[PDB]
Amino acid sequence: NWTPEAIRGLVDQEKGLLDPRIYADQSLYELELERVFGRSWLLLGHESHVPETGDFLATYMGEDPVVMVRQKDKSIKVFLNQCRHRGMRICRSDAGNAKAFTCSYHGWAYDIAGKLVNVPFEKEAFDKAEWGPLQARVATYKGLVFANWDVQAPDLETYLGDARPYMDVMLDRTPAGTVAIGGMQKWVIPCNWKFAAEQFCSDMYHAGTTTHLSGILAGIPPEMDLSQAQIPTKGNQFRAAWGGHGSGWYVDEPGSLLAVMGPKVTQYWTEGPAAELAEQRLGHTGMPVRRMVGQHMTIFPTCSFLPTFNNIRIWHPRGPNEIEVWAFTLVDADAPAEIKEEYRRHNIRNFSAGGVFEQDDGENWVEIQKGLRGYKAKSQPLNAQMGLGRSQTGHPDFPGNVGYVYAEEAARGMYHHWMRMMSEPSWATLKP
Amino acid sequence: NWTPEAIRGLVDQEKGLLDPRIYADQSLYELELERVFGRSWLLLGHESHVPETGDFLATYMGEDPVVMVRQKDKSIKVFLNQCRHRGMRICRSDAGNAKAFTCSYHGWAYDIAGKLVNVPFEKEAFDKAEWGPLQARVATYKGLVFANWDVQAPDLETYLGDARPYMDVMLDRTPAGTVAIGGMQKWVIPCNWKFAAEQFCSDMYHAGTTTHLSGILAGIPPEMDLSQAQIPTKGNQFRAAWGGHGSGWYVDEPGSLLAVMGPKVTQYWTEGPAAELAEQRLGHTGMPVRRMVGQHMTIFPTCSFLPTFNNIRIWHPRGPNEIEVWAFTLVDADAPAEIKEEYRRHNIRNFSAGGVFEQDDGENWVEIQKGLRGYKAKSQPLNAQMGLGRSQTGHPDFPGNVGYVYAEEAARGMYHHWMRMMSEPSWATLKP
Amino acid sequence: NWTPEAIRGLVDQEKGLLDPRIYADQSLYELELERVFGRSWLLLGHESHVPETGDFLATYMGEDPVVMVRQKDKSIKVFLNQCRHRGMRICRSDAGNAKAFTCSYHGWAYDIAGKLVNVPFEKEAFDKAEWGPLQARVATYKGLVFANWDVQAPDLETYLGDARPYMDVMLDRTPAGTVAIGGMQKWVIPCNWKFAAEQFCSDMYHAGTTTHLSGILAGIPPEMDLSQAQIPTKGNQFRAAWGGHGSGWYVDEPGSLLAVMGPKVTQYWTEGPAAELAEQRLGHTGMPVRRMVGQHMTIFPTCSFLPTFNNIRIWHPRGPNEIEVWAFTLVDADAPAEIKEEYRRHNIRNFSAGGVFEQDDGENWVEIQKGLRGYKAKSQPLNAQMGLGRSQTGHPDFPGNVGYVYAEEAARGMYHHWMRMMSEPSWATLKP
Amino acid sequence: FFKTFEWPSKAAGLELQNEIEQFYYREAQLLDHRAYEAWFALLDKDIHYFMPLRTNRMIREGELEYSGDQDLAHFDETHETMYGRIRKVTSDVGWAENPPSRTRHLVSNVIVKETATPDTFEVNSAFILYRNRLERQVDIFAGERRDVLRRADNNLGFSIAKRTILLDASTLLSNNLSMFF
Amino acid sequence: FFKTFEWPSKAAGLELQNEIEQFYYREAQLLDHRAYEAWFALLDKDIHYFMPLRTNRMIREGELEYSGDQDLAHFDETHETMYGRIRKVTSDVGWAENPPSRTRHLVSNVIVKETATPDTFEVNSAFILYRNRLERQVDIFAGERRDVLRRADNNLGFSIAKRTILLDASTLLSNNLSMFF
Amino acid sequence: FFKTFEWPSKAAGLELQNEIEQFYYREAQLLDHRAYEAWFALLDKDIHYFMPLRTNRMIREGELEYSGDQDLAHFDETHETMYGRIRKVTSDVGWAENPPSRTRHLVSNVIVKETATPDTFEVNSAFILYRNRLERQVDIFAGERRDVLRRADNNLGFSIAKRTILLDASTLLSNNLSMFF
Numbered sequence A, B, C: 001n002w003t004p005e006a007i008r009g010l011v012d013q014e015k016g017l018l019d020p021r022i023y024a025d026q027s028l029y030e031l032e033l034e035r036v037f038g039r040s041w042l043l044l045g046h047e048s049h050v051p052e053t054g055d056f057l058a059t060y061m062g063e064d065p066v067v068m069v070r071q072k073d074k075s076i077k078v079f080l081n082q083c084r085h086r087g088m089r090i091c092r093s094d095a096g097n098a099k100a101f102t103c104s105y106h107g108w109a110y111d112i113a114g115k116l117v118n119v120p121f122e123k124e125a126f127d128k129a130e131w132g133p134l135q136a137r138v139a140t141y142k143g144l145v146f147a148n149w150d151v152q153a154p155d156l157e158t159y160l161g162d163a164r165p166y167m168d169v170m171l172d173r174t175p176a177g178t179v180a181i182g183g184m185q186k187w188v189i190p191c192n193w194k195f196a197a198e199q200f201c202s203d204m205y206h207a208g209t210t211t212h213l214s215g216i217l218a219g220i221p222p223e224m225d226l227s228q229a230q231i232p233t234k235g236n237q238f239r240a241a242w243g244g245h246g247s248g249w250y251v252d253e254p255g256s257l258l259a260v261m262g263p264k265v266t267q268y269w270t271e272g273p274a275a276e277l278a279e280q281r282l283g284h285t286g287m288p289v290r291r292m293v294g295q296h297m298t299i300f301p302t303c304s305f306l307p308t309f310n311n312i313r314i315w316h317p318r319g320p321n322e323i324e325v326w327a328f329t330l331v332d333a334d335a336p337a338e339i340k341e342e343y344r345r346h347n348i349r350n351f352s353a354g355g356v357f358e359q360d361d362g363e364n365w366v367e368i369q370k371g372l373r374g375y376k377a378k379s380q381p382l383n384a385q386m387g388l389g390r391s392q393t394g395h396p397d398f399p400g401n402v403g404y405v406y407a408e409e410a411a412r413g414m415y416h417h418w419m420r421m422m423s424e425p426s427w428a429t430l431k432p
Numbered sequence D, E, F: 001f002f003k004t005f006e007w008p009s010k011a012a013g014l015e016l017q018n019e020i021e022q023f024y025y026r027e028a029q030l031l032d033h034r035a036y037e038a039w040f041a042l043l044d045k046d047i048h049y050f051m052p053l054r055t056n057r058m059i060r061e062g063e064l065e066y067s068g069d070q071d072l073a074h075f076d077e078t079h080e081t082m083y084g085r086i087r088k089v090t091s092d093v094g095w096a097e098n099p100p101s102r103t104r105h106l107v108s109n110v111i112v113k114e115t116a117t118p119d120t121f122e123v124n125s126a127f128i129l130y131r132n133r134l135e136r137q138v139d140i141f142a143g144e145r146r147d148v149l150r151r152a153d154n155n156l157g158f159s160i161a162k163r164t165i166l167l168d169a170s171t172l173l174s175n176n177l178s179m180f181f
């Protein structure tokens, strides 16, 4: 078995070393479902996925099927999509409206709250209030819905901590808040979830180098070539004080935003009444938001978004060697009809399974996972030494542990917290 | 490796609780092939599947391929379909007639009894009488052929015990005995065998609630719908004194038989010379078999049938997350052609992979098993409390431990015996 | 975990017994990757596959992807096809010529020696010469390129030992040496590697009995049928003194060569200037090569070839239940164009995925592996008793431990050496 | 029992060839878009909708590959039993197809033969039936259909009198056959 | 919002049927042999290349199966954005298709409908797209295409003015959609 | 090197198109019902039956994808060699096909071109070969065929002078190639 001492030596944030077995090992993965996914806050979607009473979304927490459902009192509930009788799935569609939920196996009926309210032949053949599906804790953050099984786990706000200001770049720009664009794309990648989560946590490096050369080329005019494409170098990276969360962004490099989102969005982000209302609201953080572009973020373990592009996705783990990508797009509720359309179009073009950027990430992760089947490929540590000891907590513009955009400080913090969650059984030590 | 104490805690028949891990755990399954399937009496088919000398049928005992073949002395032999030289399949077709069996790898020849009669180049390179494939103990119960590897196990009749009267409702109606209608239907379901074994053992509940509403509707006249359909409520359920066997049936509900099998079979089962001969041949049990309809039965572990419908099936395990269903139909040998055709047609219509009843079982089981991939879905006991403490041994009509038709006493018994077989290494304690 | 005592129990060369679990156990397989494939000399191909500077071939060592690339200094280097940053595959094509190797994830550039020569933004964000992909030892034997990860392991010559002469029958026929015919065929077989590795090591029996009767029929004259074709019985088998290598061949039965290879290949091998030159060059071993026909050989673990047919194959393990067969053909560099063509033609006809011989091998191996899923199928040992204690070292024509063509002495050596490598942790005792 | 389809040496006319092909393409559209009532309307009163079991036999016992008309089958249906199947599939409480699957009937290899009844045709065709349902469930079917089709005054131009579906399978790899062939 | 394709009662002539079929067989050949600039040439300046999302819905909410024109999609493209994709796939640094995949576009079920504009046709067809890449990766897709084609003076005889791909999947089982439909 | 099929600008006549299509449909029937002797009769004395290896190459080294006529291949056959293959497949001791498999050759995408010799044709067709055997084995193949077809006085109307099978696979995912393409 994986002893805490053996688990602690899998990650070395001091030397910048990672044991490749963390991406591959079966028994480690099984520890993750318990130690990581069973007590972390996990993204299920947006409040606008479930606007009115009885509205639901069939989604996941780790490998546990769950139902997110809007209540009469305007609150959101999350229960395990499993009948406690013999285990049958209670909610059998992706989304819609429910007056109730009935099991198709033996007819145990549930209200929209997940309360067991009817059992056929109950008098003829025990308390119903004691046998409903397992309830998860529900906490919202500016439109985003998060869930957590563990009652002893810290509240969302504390869990997020100093990473919140970086979420507000995407979420807190308008007083009316964000809304999710209709539809949620789902596809399957044969790779470990930590590859996907780390990339949006710390990895601008891959976009600034070789991965997305053809992605930039696709967003570049036919007469223009990659030699005329300016390499971005200016920017910063953030590692969360607690949580394993991380973010990276470019500073004064609006070429990168243009090559992805086009002129109409680039203008909406940087110039005009809306761009001005944003920096006023985000003034208390002290961040030059109108100057931040190409931003990536991960809220540990599997909530990842691209604040400049409004691209959000959830990584559902499916063993050590497979994930599911569940991705959606946000827009400001009051944003013009032309602007919403531009966010919609460019997100599809760039970040869906067929996306000109997304296609290449899938190719990379798949070939890494395949390699980790080899013995010697797991025998030596992987390099995570970028920006080792170059970041400091006193930046004039950006709060928290901030360094260079091309670094792995956010990465080292992500894996270190992963290590911590896997080796510490009690929140007594784990909590911030 | 699981300890006997840890295995005993997986099932609790007193409280009516089941650990969901039993349907999913890999190492529990590897135990099941040794502790359960390695020493249980297992259905392989019917005498009439192999009527003449040399007639064979390739089938399974757990995940071990076996050959059932009729001998010249009218006895039936069963041996492992594995050559002891380097493991090749000796019998490579589904069924047929053999005069001999020859290995295709190195040409080791065998007779129809499974004895090694010729080894090529034996003089140039050991006794052939010691190197034939493993032989199973073979026993026949009123047409049905059973097999068991374990020489220390209780014989068939003793193994069956007080479950025999309920088998005879299907098997002992005429002095001519039953014959198997030609055809062995095979399909794959991604679920644990225990769900399927249990349903036929104990679960009339699913048919009398929500699972088969569309199945009933399929037989219902075009001008009629479900609101007019009678819901059977009268009936009983049997738990075997030993073995985890079970059965359940409706009492005085001929409309429930009409809705499934049609009028001609309902007539044949309830009224006339044949129906009266059947009750007088089972007079020793004291059972009103003309009033027994819709019956379901499992002979633990994986022998399941539907006595009133003449449907029989074997569940071959294929890991904790998969089974194969091998189904066939019986008829009394001296039944009128008209009745045999009605049993054949309705069994295809209702209980094949395309069957209007079957479809919804496979659909339910697939979802349950998917749900068990999750950590939280395996963390809480499943409810098996139906009919708890309501069963008694002194029923005027039906012998043995008997309760109400909608109970889970037969299930608890199946799971209790599963637990016993899994936790008790020796037959010294395990036998009746 | 598997104890050295338990490992020794899996093979008994004295009684000639084998535990079937060796072909099925997942924990034994994981040990094989470390204890066998981690430190054995593994074939990657031929020098002619990489003749020019920069020419590469992507292949495997166990389940580790490796790159074999020709250097400017005329030598061959073998390195792990894995970038040490985040595990991305460096060389992403089957074969070709390269000037540099570049990772597609973050752009770490490598030279054709596997040295990390460039890191994007290195100065802005650690010693490059320390972070190159794990290098393997490379050693060539008369055209054939072998590789080994273990620096403590004996050199290729010492590893091969008295098996070298039998490799010379194929490799040492002309001072011109051999050349690999273009093209390497690759297919997947769901079976354990040891079945495939043993067959070429020791198993003439399968080809001499039933496996290839239709293969012979396919190559035999159209006017002739099987009952007219002569069965070869004369020949010998060789067990290596160390390493688990083994070979087998027919003696004075050229009709066996004619059926498989045709009359022209038969003439070239047995009669004329080339046949007598090959017997002169191998005179130091005293072997009458012209009389040796239909030869098979394995260099432990996964290097197998048919010398007389010029067919060579590497088995890539893919779990205990799967392999990949990578096959290529040799010819004498100075052989007649029609001989080169006859070797090319008859290898495709006989030994490719659709080959008239190969078809039946896969068919057998598939059904063996499927059978080993069962509990009882793994419960009794397999018979490896052919030619037990019937081999000797003082043979007038062939050097080493030699017995009858139909024997399992070489097989016992291969399994005994497998057992030795799996149990003994150090080359201190393991070496010859 | 089935063996090679006895195609006529004289191939059917281009107009007739096109009509039958177009009938199948329309039918596939009806099935894939779950127009079950409209597809069932094509079935004649005397319909025999049949799918025999297929077994692994040694070449010597090749006459026993397919199950017979008095044996079990995957489907052995009449107009009356098919109606029930249509009843179930269109039903809100029909769990196997609610939510419904996503099918594709790719039809090709159409060989048309005249019978002894004018405007009645014996048609041999091949198909791959791709069925996707729930989240990740994929079931691929392949085989041939042997039909007896009648000229009819309907939206598709033909009615179905007989259908025998010869599936390329012994053991079914799907958990059910909740789709129509 | 799709439903059964509205085929005309009068089936399109044999000449036009063969013209549209050969077009798709030619288009497939270009796509399977990676002739991307040659394939892109078929796309009109006003092309809408569309692949909506598909969801699991109860029969009662069947109207909600496909995503809307203002929802996310797998593809929602113009002539300009399509060329970007052609730039990417022909790029030496486009890793998803370098090395390139090995695709097969098997086309059948072609139903031609004439429209108010002569030489402009609304076409329905079914396909199975088999994709094989690298060592062992196999991705199989099935579905239908709903095209609006125009008569063109190119090498293929037609140009694509519109294309809706209805894929038989909810969750995509492939890691990407690097291929063209 | 193979590249896009050089289709004629003027497509073949409806009659000929139909003849070539029907030829393959009958051919697939012969193979899928194991009429091997009858299918072997279709092969001319100068038959080249060829299936080259396919490899993963960078766009740059694209000309090296397929193996050459002096490299190894999956199939490289003459009439004499095919004879032995037919002799084996029909044999009682041909274990790979006894018990025989269950195959479906689904032919489409037929593009016909008239060659140098009159009544000799250059044909391109796409296929999927579904192969099911024993209990649960399923091997799926996809690709295109390049045929030289001569008019013949047999039951199918044509004979096969040359066949090149371009398989969409690098590594073969099947354990063998006991079937015919």
Ligand SMILES: c1ccc(-c2ccccc2)cc1
Binding pocket: A199, A200, A201, A203, A204, A207, A212, A256, A260, A294, A295, A296, A306, A357
């Ligand atoms: C993680 C995910 C996406 C990106 C990114 C890609 C293209 C352009 C801008 C950012 C960076 C890190």
Ligand SMILES: c1ccc(-c2ccccc2)cc1
Binding pocket: B199, B200, B201, B203, B204, B207, B212, B260, B294, B295, B296, B306, B357
């Ligand atoms: C287990 C399996 C099937 C049934 C059943 C199905 C339909 C009608 C009557 C009983 C009951 C228990």
Ligand SMILES: c1ccc(-c2ccccc2)cc1
Binding pocket: C199, C200, C201, C203, C204, C207, C212, C260, C294, C295, C296, C306, C357
């Ligand atoms: C392993 C593989 C092939 C052969 C063999 C095949 C044909 C003729 C002679 C030997 C022997 C062992």
Ligand code: FES
Binding pocket: A083, A084, A085, A086, A087, A088, A103, A104, A105, A106, A107, A108
């Ligand atoms: S499983 Fe939900 S009621 Fe039985």
Ligand code: FES
Binding pocket: B083, B084, B085, B086, B087, B088, B103, B104, B105, B106, B107, B108
């Ligand atoms: S394996 Fe059965 S004879 Fe060798």
Ligand code: FES
Binding pocket: C083, C084, C085, C086, C087, C088, C103, C104, C105, C106, C107, C108
């Ligand atoms: S993985 Fe090779 S550079 Fe990042």
Ligand SMILES: [Fe+2]
Binding pocket: A206, A207, A211, A357, A358, A361
């Ligand atoms: Fe990316």
Ligand SMILES: [Fe+2]
Binding pocket: B206, B207, B211, B212, B357, B358, B361
């Ligand atoms: Fe049921």
Ligand SMILES: [Fe+2]
Binding pocket: C206, C207, C211, C212, C357, C361
């Ligand atoms: Fe062999």
